[PDB]
Amino acid sequence: AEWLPGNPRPSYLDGSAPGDFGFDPLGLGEVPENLERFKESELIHARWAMLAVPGVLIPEALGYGNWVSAQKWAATPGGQATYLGNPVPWGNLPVILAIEFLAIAFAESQRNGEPDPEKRKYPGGAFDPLGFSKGANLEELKLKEIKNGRLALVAFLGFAVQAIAYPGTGPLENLKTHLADPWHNTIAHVIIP
Amino acid sequence: VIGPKRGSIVKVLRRESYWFNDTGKVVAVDQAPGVRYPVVVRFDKVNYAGVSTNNYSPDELEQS
Amino acid sequence: DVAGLTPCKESKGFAKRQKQEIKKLEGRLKLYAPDSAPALAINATIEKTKRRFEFYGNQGLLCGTDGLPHLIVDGDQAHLGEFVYPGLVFLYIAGWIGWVGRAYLIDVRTSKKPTEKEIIIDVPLALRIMSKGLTWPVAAIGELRSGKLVEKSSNITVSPR
Amino acid sequence: MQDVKTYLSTAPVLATLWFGFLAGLLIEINRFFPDALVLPL
Amino acid sequence: ASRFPKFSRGLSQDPTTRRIWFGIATAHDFESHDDMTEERLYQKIFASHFGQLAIIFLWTSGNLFHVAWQGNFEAWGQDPLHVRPIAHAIWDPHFGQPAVEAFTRGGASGPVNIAYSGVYQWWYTIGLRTNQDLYGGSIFLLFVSALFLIAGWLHLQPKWKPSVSWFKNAESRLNHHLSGLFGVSSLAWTGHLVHVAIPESRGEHVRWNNLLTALPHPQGLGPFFAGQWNVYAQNPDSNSHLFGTSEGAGTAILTFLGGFHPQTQSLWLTDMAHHHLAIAVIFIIAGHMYRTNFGIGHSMKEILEAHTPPGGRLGRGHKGLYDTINNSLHFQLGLALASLGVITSLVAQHMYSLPPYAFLAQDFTTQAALYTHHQYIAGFIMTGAFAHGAIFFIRDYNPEQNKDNVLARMLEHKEAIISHLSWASLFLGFHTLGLYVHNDVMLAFGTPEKQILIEPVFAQWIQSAHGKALYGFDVLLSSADSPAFNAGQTLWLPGWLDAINNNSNSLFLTIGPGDFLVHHAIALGLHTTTLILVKGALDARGSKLMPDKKEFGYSFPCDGPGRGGTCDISAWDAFYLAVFWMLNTIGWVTFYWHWKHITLWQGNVAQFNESSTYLMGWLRDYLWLNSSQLINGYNPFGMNSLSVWAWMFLFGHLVWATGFMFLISWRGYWQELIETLAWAHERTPLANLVRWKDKPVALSIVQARLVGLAHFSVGYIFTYAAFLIASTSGKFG
Amino acid sequence: TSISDSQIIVALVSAFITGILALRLGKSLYQ
Amino acid sequence: ANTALTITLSTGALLFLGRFVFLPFQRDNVSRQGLPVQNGVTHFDAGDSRAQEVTSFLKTNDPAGFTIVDVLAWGALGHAVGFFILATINNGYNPQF
Amino acid sequence: ISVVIFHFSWKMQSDVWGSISDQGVVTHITGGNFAQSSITINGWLRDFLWAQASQVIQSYGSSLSAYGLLFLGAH
Numbered sequence A: 001a002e003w004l005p006g007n008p009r010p011s012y013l014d015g016s017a018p019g020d021f022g023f024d025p026l027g028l029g030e031v032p033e034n035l036e037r038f039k040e041s042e043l044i045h046a047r048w049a050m051l052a053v054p055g056v057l058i059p060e061a062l063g064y065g066n067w068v069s070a071q072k073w074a075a076t077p078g079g080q081a082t083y084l085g086n087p088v089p090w091g092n093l094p095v096i097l098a099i100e101f102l103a104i105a106f107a108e109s110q111r112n113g114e115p116d117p118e119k120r121k122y123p124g125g126a127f128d129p130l131g132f133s134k135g136a137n138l139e140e141l142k143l144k145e146i147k148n149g150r151l152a153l154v155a156f157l158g159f160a161v162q163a164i165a166y167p168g169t170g171p172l173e174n175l176k177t178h179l180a181d182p183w184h185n186t187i188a189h190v191i192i193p
Numbered sequence B: 001v002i003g004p005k006r007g008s009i010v011k012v013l014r015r016e017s018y019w020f021n022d023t024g025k026v027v028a029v030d031q032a033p034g035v036r037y038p039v040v041v042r043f044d045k046v047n048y049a050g051v052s053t054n055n056y057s058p059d060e061l062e063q064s
Numbered sequence C: 001d002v003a004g005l006t007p008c009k010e011s012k013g014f015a016k017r018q019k020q021e022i023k024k025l026e027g028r029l030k031l032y033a034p035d036s037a038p039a040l041a042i043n044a045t046i047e048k049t050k051r052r053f054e055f056y057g058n059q060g061l062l063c064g065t066d067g068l069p070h071l072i073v074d075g076d077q078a079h080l081g082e083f084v085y086p087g088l089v090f091l092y093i094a095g096w097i098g099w100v101g102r103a104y105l106i107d108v109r110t111s112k113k114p115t116e117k118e119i120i121i122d123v124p125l126a127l128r129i130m131s132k133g134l135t136w137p138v139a140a141i142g143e144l145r146s147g148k149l150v151e152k153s154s155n156i157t158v159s160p161r
Numbered sequence D: 001m002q003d004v005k006t007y008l009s010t011a012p013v014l015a016t017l018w019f020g021f022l023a024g025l026l027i028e029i030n031r032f033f034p035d036a037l038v039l040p041l
Numbered sequence E: 001a002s003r004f005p006k007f008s009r010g011l012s013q014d015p016t017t018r019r020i021w022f023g024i025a026t027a028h029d030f031e032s033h034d035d036m037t038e039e040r041l042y043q044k045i046f047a048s049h050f051g052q053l054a055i056i057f058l059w060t061s062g063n064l065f066h067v068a069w070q071g072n073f074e075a076w077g078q079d080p081l082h083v084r085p086i087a088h089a090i091w092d093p094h095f096g097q098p099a100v101e102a103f104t105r106g107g108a109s110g111p112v113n114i115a116y117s118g119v120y121q122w123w124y125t126i127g128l129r130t131n132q133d134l135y136g137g138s139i140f141l142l143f144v145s146a147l148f149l150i151a152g153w154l155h156l157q158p159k160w161k162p163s164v165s166w167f168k169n170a171e172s173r174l175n176h177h178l179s180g181l182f183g184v185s186s187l188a189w190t191g192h193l194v195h196v197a198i199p200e201s202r203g204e205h206v207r208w209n210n211l212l213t214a215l216p217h218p219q220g221l222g223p224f225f226a227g228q229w230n231v232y233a234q235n236p237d238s239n240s241h242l243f244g245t246s247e248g249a250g251t252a253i254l255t256f257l258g259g260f261h262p263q264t265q266s267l268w269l270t271d272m273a274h275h276h277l278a279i280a281v282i283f284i285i286a287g288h289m290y291r292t293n294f295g296i297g298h299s300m301k302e303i304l305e306a307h308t309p310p311g312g313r314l315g316r317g318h319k320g321l322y323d324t325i326n327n328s329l330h331f332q333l334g335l336a337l338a339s340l341g342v343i344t345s346l347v348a349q350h351m352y353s354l355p356p357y358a359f360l361a362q363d364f365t366t367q368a369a370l371y372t373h374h375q376y377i378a379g380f381i382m383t384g385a386f387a388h389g390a391i392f393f394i395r396d397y398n399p400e401q402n403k404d405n406v407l408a409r410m411l412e413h414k415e416a417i418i419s420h421l422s423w424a425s426l427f428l429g430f431h432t433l434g435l436y437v438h439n440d441v442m443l444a445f446g447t448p449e450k451q452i453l454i455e456p457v458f459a460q461w462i463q464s465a466h467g468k469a470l471y472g473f474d475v476l477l478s479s480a481d482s483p484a485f486n487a488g489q490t491l492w493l494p495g496w497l498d499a500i501n502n503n504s505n506s507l508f509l510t511i512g513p514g515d516f517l518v519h520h521a522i523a524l525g526l527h528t529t530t531l532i533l534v535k536g537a538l539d540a541r542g543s544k545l546m547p548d549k550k551e552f553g554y555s556f557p558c559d560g561p562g563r564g565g566t567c568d569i570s571a572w573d574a575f576y577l578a579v580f581w582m583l584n585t586i587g588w589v590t591f592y593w594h595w596k597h598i599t600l601w602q603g604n605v606a607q608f609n610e611s612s613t614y615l616m617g618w619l620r621d622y623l624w625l626n627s628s629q630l631i632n633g634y635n636p637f638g639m640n641s642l643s644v645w646a647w648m649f650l651f652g653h654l655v656w657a658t659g660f661m662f663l664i665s666w667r668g669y670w671q672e673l674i675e676t677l678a679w680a681h682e683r684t685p686l687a688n689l690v691r692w693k694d695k696p697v698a699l700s701i702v703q704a705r706l707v708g709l710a711h712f713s714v715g716y717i718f719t720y721a722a723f724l725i726a727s728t729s730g731k732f733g
Numbered sequence F: 001t002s003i004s005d006s007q008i009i010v011a012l013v014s015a016f017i018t019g020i021l022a023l024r025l026g027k028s029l030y031q
Numbered sequence G: 001a002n003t004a005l006t007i008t009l010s011t012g013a014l015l016f017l018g019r020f021v022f023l024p025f026q027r028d029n030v031s032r033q034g035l036p037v038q039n040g041v042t043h044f045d046a047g048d049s050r051a052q053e054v055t056s057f058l059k060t061n062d063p064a065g066f067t068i069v070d071v072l073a074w075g076a077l078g079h080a081v082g083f084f085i086l087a088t089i090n091n092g093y094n095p096q097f
Numbered sequence H: 001i002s003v004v005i006f007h008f009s010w011k012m013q014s015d016v017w018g019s020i021s022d023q024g025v026v027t028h029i030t031g032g033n034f035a036q037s038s039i040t041i042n043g044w045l046r047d048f049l050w051a052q053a054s055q056v057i058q059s060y061g062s063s064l065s066a067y068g069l070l071f072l073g074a075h
Ligand code: CLA
Pocket: A047, A048, A050, A051, A054, A121, A122, A123, A124, A125, A127, A128, A131, A132, A133, A138, A141, A142, A143, A144, A145, A146, A148, A149
């Protein structure tokens, strides 16, 4: 059901889990622990994509360029990275990347070292400063989370494929192009030219 | 009785047999106490030596 | 051009080979009377060569260094007639033959003396099996999906490990 | 005629007939459609 | 009663000449000797390895000594492109005066052999210049071999014999061999290149007496320890540099130019130094992977157990493979020989297209000989790898411990593997042979335009992706807008593109329909030889015809004429049958290489491009055409320096036919004939006084097969070597 | 330059010693 | 480019990574893998006198169990990273993407 | 039989078969080289197998091309 009405569900996907629409044509979740790992990885990927989409749309909307050209400073020698127009004095190539490595390694290590799978997916505690877990609307909130998350995941994949399709162009500029000639500039320009 | 009924179709579980995973017809089963391979099986196709029959114990024959 | 190959229409080596073959045939012809049968045979040869080379030129064949048509088998749309189209025709014919042979074997394993049917072919049975090969791919897909095409590994003789 | 038809249905006789028919077909095709390296379509 | 085969009681008690043959032929099968313990087996193998190392070093020291004593190494170095190298002097009492004066080449005072091993170019590249240098090297290698002999004797003594557990310490051995044997050795070699070879190629003379005085770089070890390594690449050698001469030389010791040296048509010495330094760093890092004694590293067994797919498609995965591999020396030998054969093929394929030695590309006969040598060595090594895999299955494979792991799954679906190899071989053979016969018939009927000439567009696309602009695909270093081209245009592409767009060398030769057909023939040969070898390896333990083949061993004659006949039913017989196919495949490979390079060197590549598409061209324009000078080595009108190669050509033909004799007539004829001859000797007067001690018997079936195979292979090798050298040296082109 | 007779005899003596060591190793492998 | 500063920073960063964020993971993995085993038992248990773990050299008083061998390993990684950084900065190679 | 027929062919092409001119000069197909070349196995390889096989391998494109085709097919 759900993803395909009338379709029999696989046994390992009963439907109780958030976002469980029974979509598994390749049977990747047959092994239970692999299924739990896939749930965790789906949540992490979805959260990263959620946080990534505004970091792609807002800077382009404000005139600071698209996301594909966001690393374009690093490609040139002496890029002098910028933030909201203001240059970043510590934005040389051999310091920001090391800082990224150390900090992300710390957060990744703290996350990797928690036994309970439920807290591996939804830790809570210090990550809920505004509550949002005392109420009874928690499960549907998880469902909303996974729904916006898969939506943003497909959105970022669209960003990437459009980056290959039209190099030097941003997703919002592609939206403008579609609004300009919706019946001449579509995906057909790439797959059937 | 000892093994399968006469005329029944039996499948061979002997790994070293030419007819492993093949079906044959039971011809006779000997009830003498002491015989190790009493079941006689006839096969539709011959082996390399040209023999189309063999003897098996009931534990290495299964019912279809 | 698809690996630095010029089209054979404007290939100088192709025309040189045309000229050389025609000249050789005419040299062989000079030693026979015009009305003689050997002269007719050689003139038929000349016409055959001329039409062969015109046909090769008209289909946009790719000639390399000197005149020799080269075949492109990478799937290019301009060369589908070299390997993909005849390849598909071959696949249809070969699959026909194999499928009808398999069907005949199936239909003679239920006979009382199959070996006699293999050494002495049941021509009516064989012919009405052969007639079924027209739509062989559909039957093959149907048997594959239904599970009647592939024997289960539990019923196949294997040697000890 | 039963025995004659049975003999004619034997493997070698039928192979001879079938392969001769195939060879004649191919030879005649080459008579009318010779020296082709490309399937025209 | 303790006769010659002291390691086999059964052979010692054989009263026939079979005892001698089998004692000779079963000496090194240590596991089969009577009263053999694993400890003694390992120690004997260790000492035999020491002996082999000593023999190898003696062989190279003898090469050095003979080149120093009877060679023209100095004269060759003064003028490499117009001096023929000398291998060694000839003292044959059977020569006549014409033979004495025919073999006086290379500016010698008597008959000499002209070397075709490339040792002159190799030693000139690595800095050796005079005969005293070669003599010192030979003496040093004599000392090294003596040291290895001393070590081999020493580790066999009671108080220095290693234990079995020491021999099974896989992690420590890998760590030491990756770090020191591979990494530190390469570091030392790049140190040699920096200190000796490069200064020698730039006119400086650095020896042991001034190693600590000669400065490899003007800024010595300053920028190395300051992190500014670019200083070691600021001043590369110019294109006007002359090897061994200070004119046009530079000061950089670790460059990254790529391509070839314009004057020697070989790789730059600084590029090779940087290569060896980089791989030394990588190998030394890699050798710190496994856990030996310090609590850090990896457990290889646990790595193997951990690597099992959760879906069960591979079964239990690699569980139990560590013990199976560490306990079985035949598995290790098979893996080593597989890797060594692949790497030998790589060496052969990379040294002809990327010559590392100065003035080696100009030496055409040396290049051809080196390629053929290493390709045949690689083929033999691959056959050995598969044979030892079969021996592993027969003697060392335990299904109990290897239960449902990858090896058991290979044994389970072996019929599928063999059937698909059969299909691939059949398809390749049918279609390649049919295309060749089609082309033959079209050339025979005078209509070459009707050939089926298939353009190798996939390999040409790869060539374009490597920078070849001849085919006009314009992608991946053939296009300016490609990101790979932009990334590489600063470092190697200036040299690499220049070298690959030069058609005068063998770097990515132009290919056509003949190249397509011959590569498909090569694929046929590889697939068929692999089919035979894998079938032997996987049917070694048993089959439907012989379910209990494992109890009969690896090499047994047959199982008698019962069950329809069981000739060549052993896995050793599969190896016997695959040796013919590997010989054929390497013959095809070397035939292609040799013809392609003859037509490249002579400058008329049109002959190959037009004649290689049909087999009559192969017979006439390659075999018949290039053998004219070979067969005229000696004739009624005289003889020349190619007489030895003509004689070896005929000799190889004769040995090939004698191999035919041992392969066709099988045993019984000769046993009856020997019976008759024994009667004759026993009944002849003045000769029945002389009596044999070993009863003369005909050769056994397995022995007959092996002797016929040896004759066949020796004839193959000698005939082709004679033809190759005679046709590449009679016309230096 | 060309090697001398002293060098030749040094090489011969070294080879003789290596042969002695080889015979020793062969006798050690034998038993 | 400052050699001393880069080397010190890289070595300190990788030592910190090995001491605080990666030490528990490395400990768990060495506990899971354990000593290499020859056939059922360890190499030393099989009779290899030279395969015994060097306990004297592995003794440490660091509260987290950081050993001098671990110090050497993480310092080697840090020096490798620092020299990679120094060689790439002092390179002059600009792909200009 | 192979050696017998090879001996016949070489001896006839060398010493018997040939052409006579008006003056009376007899030239032979091979040139009378059997007396000095048949004594050597290299002579058989070169002056008979290599020299006299030049026509079967160069017969392509002519009425003798079938002989070259069957030469290779028999191989
Ligand atoms: C709209 C998407 C969405 C939704 C519905 C949820 C919902 C939930 N999350 Mg998830 N989460 C998301 C996105 C989302 N999250 C993203 C993008 C991240 C990465 C930063 C996380 C990281 C995260 C962690 C680490 C944890 C949760 C937890 C929770 C639960 C309690 C908090 C809550 O009710 O959120 C309500 C969410 C909203 C009302 C969305 C409001 C949007 C705000 C205002 C930001 C938008 C600003 C701007 C447009 C984007 C710029 C980014 C900004 C940060 C600079 C609940 C199931 C906790 C949990 O389940 O434990 C019990 C928990 O431990 N989430």
